[PDB]
Amino acid sequence: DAMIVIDGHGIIQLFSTAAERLFGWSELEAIGQNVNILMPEPDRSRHDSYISRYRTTSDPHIIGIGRIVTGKRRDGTTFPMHLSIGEMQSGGEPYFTGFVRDLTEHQQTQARLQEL
Numbered sequence: 001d002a003m004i005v006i007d008g009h010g011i012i013q014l015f016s017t018a019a020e021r022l023f024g025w026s027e028l029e030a031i032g033q034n035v036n037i038l039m040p041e042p043d044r045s046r047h048d049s050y051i052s053r054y055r056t057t058s059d060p061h062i063i064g065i066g067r068i069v070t071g072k073r074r075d076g077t078t079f080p081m082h083l084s085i086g087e088m089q090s091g092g093e094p095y096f097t098g099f100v101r102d103l104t105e106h107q108q109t110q111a112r113l114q115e116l
């Protein structure tokens with residue numbers, strides 16, 4: 001669905017139309033923001049350390065692994081999503097690309113079914 005590109009500092013460089021629909025931030029609003037604006041606390045507070053940690057250590061926790069996370073929308077409502085990260089690099093700098101699958105639908109069916 002969503003695609004998003006950050007600099008090695010977690011600043012949003014690119015923001016696809018999907019993500020716009022997914023998160024409810026227009027591309028402009030979104031560009032030049034910290035990516036943490038898309039998650040809840042406590043994650044939202046740590047995200048930078050998530051990044052400085054990987055930079056100095058080169059140990060991947062999501063990169064090439066993938067994970068299921070809670071994402072936060074603009075109007076504050078949260079959701080699950082599968083998150084994948086790609087490391088590229090341009091202008092000598094490392095750039096990260098997030099691909100996002102919304103899982104709201106699956107989680108809700110699974111709840112509904114559990115409930116019945």
Ligand code: HEM
Nearest residue numbers: 004038039043050054060061062063069070071096097098
């Ligand atoms: C909006 C919801 C998001 C959440 C909740 C989330 C959560 C996380 C978590 C949990 C980690 C490392 C976990 C650990 O240390 O065990 C992480 C690391 C990282 N995330 Fe975020 N993420 C989100 C979106 C994004 C997006 C869209 C990108 C764009 C590329 C991104 C880039 C990164 C990078 C580069 C790392 C370090 C690499 C690694 O840990 O392998 N994140 N994030």
